[PDB]
Design an enzyme around this catalytic site. Structure first.
Site, PDB file in Angstrom:
ATOM      1  N   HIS A  62      84.502 -11.300  59.795  1.00  0.00           N
ATOM      2  CA  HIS A  62      84.502 -10.294  59.285  1.00  0.00           C
ATOM      3  C   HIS A  62      85.673  -9.369  59.499  1.00  0.00           C
ATOM      4  O   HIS A  62      86.062  -8.499  58.794  1.00  0.00           O
ATOM      5  CB  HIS A  62      83.292  -9.460  60.238  1.00  0.00           C
ATOM      6  CG  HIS A  62      82.072 -10.343  60.192  1.00  0.00           C
ATOM      7  ND1 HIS A  62      81.424 -10.650  61.341  1.00  0.00           N
ATOM      8  CD2 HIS A  62      81.208 -10.658  59.162  1.00  0.00           C
ATOM      9  CE1 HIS A  62      80.379 -11.336  61.136  1.00  0.00           C
ATOM     10  NE2 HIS A  62      80.130 -11.184  59.940  1.00  0.00           N
ATOM     11  N   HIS A  92      89.995  -3.790  66.529  1.00  0.00           N
ATOM     12  CA  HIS A  92      90.013  -4.764  65.491  1.00  0.00           C
ATOM     13  C   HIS A  92      90.365  -3.636  64.398  1.00  0.00           C
ATOM     14  O   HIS A  92      90.434  -2.406  64.546  1.00  0.00           O
ATOM     15  CB  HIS A  92      88.548  -5.463  64.988  1.00  0.00           C
ATOM     16  CG  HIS A  92      87.624  -4.155  65.061  1.00  0.00           C
ATOM     17  ND1 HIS A  92      86.887  -3.787  66.006  1.00  0.00           N
ATOM     18  CD2 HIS A  92      87.066  -3.340  63.984  1.00  0.00           C
ATOM     19  CE1 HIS A  92      85.916  -2.995  65.681  1.00  0.00           C
ATOM     20  NE2 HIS A  92      85.997  -2.652  64.493  1.00  0.00           N
ATOM     21  N   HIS A  94      89.890  -2.353  60.027  1.00  0.00           N
ATOM     22  CA  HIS A  94      89.252  -2.383  58.736  1.00  0.00           C
ATOM     23  C   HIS A  94      90.325  -2.073  57.646  1.00  0.00           C
ATOM     24  O   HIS A  94      91.235  -1.333  57.865  1.00  0.00           O
ATOM     25  CB  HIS A  94      88.117  -1.270  58.659  1.00  0.00           C
ATOM     26  CG  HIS A  94      86.973  -1.645  59.768  1.00  0.00           C
ATOM     27  ND1 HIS A  94      85.775  -2.182  59.458  1.00  0.00           N
ATOM     28  CD2 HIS A  94      86.912  -1.100  61.115  1.00  0.00           C
ATOM     29  CE1 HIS A  94      85.021  -2.153  60.821  1.00  0.00           C
ATOM     30  NE2 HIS A  94      85.725  -1.371  61.649  1.00  0.00           N
ATOM     31  N   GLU A 104      87.232   3.511  56.841  1.00  0.00           N
ATOM     32  CA  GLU A 104      85.705   3.855  56.906  1.00  0.00           C
ATOM     33  C   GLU A 104      85.663   5.190  56.805  1.00  0.00           C
ATOM     34  O   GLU A 104      84.835   5.871  56.108  1.00  0.00           O
ATOM     35  CB  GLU A 104      84.953   3.032  57.918  1.00  0.00           C
ATOM     36  CG  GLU A 104      85.341   1.415  58.259  1.00  0.00           C
ATOM     37  CD  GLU A 104      84.392   0.634  58.723  1.00  0.00           C
ATOM     38  OE1 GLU A 104      84.255   0.893  59.820  1.00  0.00           O
ATOM     39  OE2 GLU A 104      83.736  -0.115  58.090  1.00  0.00           O
ATOM     40  N   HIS A 117      90.233   0.479  65.566  1.00  0.00           N
ATOM     41  CA  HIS A 117      89.066   0.662  66.295  1.00  0.00           C
ATOM     42  C   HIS A 117      89.251   0.160  67.788  1.00  0.00           C
ATOM     43  O   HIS A 117      89.499  -0.902  67.886  1.00  0.00           O
ATOM     44  CB  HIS A 117      87.665   0.104  65.749  1.00  0.00           C
ATOM     45  CG  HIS A 117      87.288   0.909  64.384  1.00  0.00           C
ATOM     46  ND1 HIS A 117      86.261   0.282  63.430  1.00  0.00           N
ATOM     47  CD2 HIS A 117      87.645   2.271  63.958  1.00  0.00           C
ATOM     48  CE1 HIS A 117      85.923   1.350  62.664  1.00  0.00           C
ATOM     49  NE2 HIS A 117      86.700   2.471  62.827  1.00  0.00           N
ATOM     50  N   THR A 196      79.629   0.456  62.806  1.00  0.00           N
ATOM     51  CA  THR A 196      79.733   0.366  61.328  1.00  0.00           C
ATOM     52  C   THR A 196      79.460  -1.185  60.539  1.00  0.00           C
ATOM     53  O   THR A 196      79.817  -1.229  59.456  1.00  0.00           O
ATOM     54  CB  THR A 196      81.163   0.817  60.834  1.00  0.00           C
ATOM     55  OG1 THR A 196      82.267   0.047  61.262  1.00  0.00           O
ATOM     56  CG2 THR A 196      81.342   2.475  61.482  1.00  0.00           C
TER      57      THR A 196
HETATM   58  N1  LIG Z   1      83.487  -1.072  63.845  1.00  0.00           N
HETATM   59  S1  LIG Z   1      82.808  -0.732  64.898  1.00  0.00           S
HETATM   60  O1  LIG Z   1      82.017   0.085  64.507  1.00  0.00           O
HETATM   61  O2  LIG Z   1      83.901   0.141  65.764  1.00  0.00           O
HETATM   62  C1  LIG Z   1      82.265  -1.974  65.736  1.00  0.00           C
HETATM   63  C2  LIG Z   1      82.453  -2.019  67.309  1.00  0.00           C
HETATM   64  C3  LIG Z   1      81.893  -3.234  68.022  1.00  0.00           C
HETATM   65  C4  LIG Z   1      81.174  -4.145  67.352  1.00  0.00           C
HETATM   66  F1  LIG Z   1      80.488  -5.192  68.225  1.00  0.00           F
HETATM   67  C5  LIG Z   1      81.037  -4.005  65.958  1.00  0.00           C
HETATM   68  C6  LIG Z   1      81.460  -2.987  65.207  1.00  0.00           C
HETATM   69 ZN   LIG Z   2      85.447  -1.511  63.370  1.00  0.00          ZN
END
Ligand SMILES: NS(=O)(=O)c1ccc(F)cc1
Ligand SMILES: [Zn+2]
Ligand SMILES: [Hg+2]
Length: 258
Positions: A62, A92, A94, A104, A117, A196
């Site tokens: 992902h 991570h 996006h 996002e 993030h 998200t």
């Molecule tokens: N993209 S995110 O909202 O920050 C997100 C954080 C932690 C997760 F395990 C999955 C998605």
């Molecule tokens: Zn994220």
């Protein structure tokens, strides 16, 4: 066979297995700067990442996550709109297939090339798994990335990507300092939201930074060369791994600055 961002398993289908998708406090949302309420009682953020321990980096199909040792209060987030201490577990990005999309959250409908993030969990809950079952279990610090000058502190991340090209690959990634990814100012907007990506749990206090960081065209180019697929499967470039803005509903976005 599982969720994704393609035509057939993209965001518009997640509601079929994750009913929460049509919920009341979903993310991300569009930040309307003229409707956010200046809240003078919000305190400044306290980002303490000096004893931070990165362990490894992996591609999970992902996106790619850099993981940290969260068995102790070594890298924490406190203050701001938060009550208690939140421990950094991972970060991570996006991003998009083009410079004009990838983020996002949006500002006045404006999309940036990517979004960082930094995920934290409320220490009062003991571990990450308990925190996701509570309305205030998570705190994610979001930073926008814009195409311009090269960001020194991002280059270590960019150099190793080639060793985790396909799903499931990981590599040791030690002694990475997360402080090199922050902008100069810590002014922010905040609102109650959710994850998200599935399971889309509404356990998050979002803290979106006003000032974005700039990264070079070549740095973002390397993100787009990763793969959604694991080794030996047909190639599907990892791009546009972002969820479109969701309805604000009965919520209010506050700003820490006038
Ligand atoms: N993209 S995110 O909202 O920050 C997100 C954080 C932690 C997760 F395990 C999955 C998605
Ligand atoms: Zn994220
Ligand atoms: Hg929750």
């Amino acid at each position: 066979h599982h969720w994704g961002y393609g035509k057939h398993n993209g965001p518009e289908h997640w509601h079929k297995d994750f009913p929460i998708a049509k919920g009341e406090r979903q993310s991300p949302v569009d930040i309307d700067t003229h409707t956010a309420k200046y809240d003078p009682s919000l305190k400044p953020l306290s980002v303490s990442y000096d004893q931070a321990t990165s362990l490894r980096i992996l591609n999970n199909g992902h996106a790619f996550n850099v993981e940290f040792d969260d068995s102790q209060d070594k890298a924490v987030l406190k203050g701001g709109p938060l009550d208690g201490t939140y421990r950094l577990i991972q970060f991570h990005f996006h991003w998009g297939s083009l410079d004009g999309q990838g983020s996002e959250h949006t500002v006045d409908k404006k999309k940036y090339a990517a979004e960082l993030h930094l995920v934290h969990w409320n220490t009062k809950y003991g571990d990450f798994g308990k925190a996701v079952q509570q309305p205030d279990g998570l705190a994610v610090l979001g930073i926008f990335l814009k195409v311009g000058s090269a960001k020194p502190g991002l280059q270590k991340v960019v150099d190793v990507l080639d060793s985790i090209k396909t799903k499931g690959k990981s590599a040791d990634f030690t002694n990475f300092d997360p402080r090199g990814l922050l902008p100069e100012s810590l002014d922010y907007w905040t609102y109650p939201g959710s994850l998200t990506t599935p399971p889309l749990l509404e356990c998050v206090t979002w803290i979106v930074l006003k000032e974005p960081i700039s990264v070079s065209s070549e740095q973002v180019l390397k993100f787009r060369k990763l793969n959604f697929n694991g080794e030996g499967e047909p190639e599907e470039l990892m791009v546009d791994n972002w969820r479109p803005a969701q309805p604000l509903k009965n919520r209010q976005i506050k700003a820490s600055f006038k």
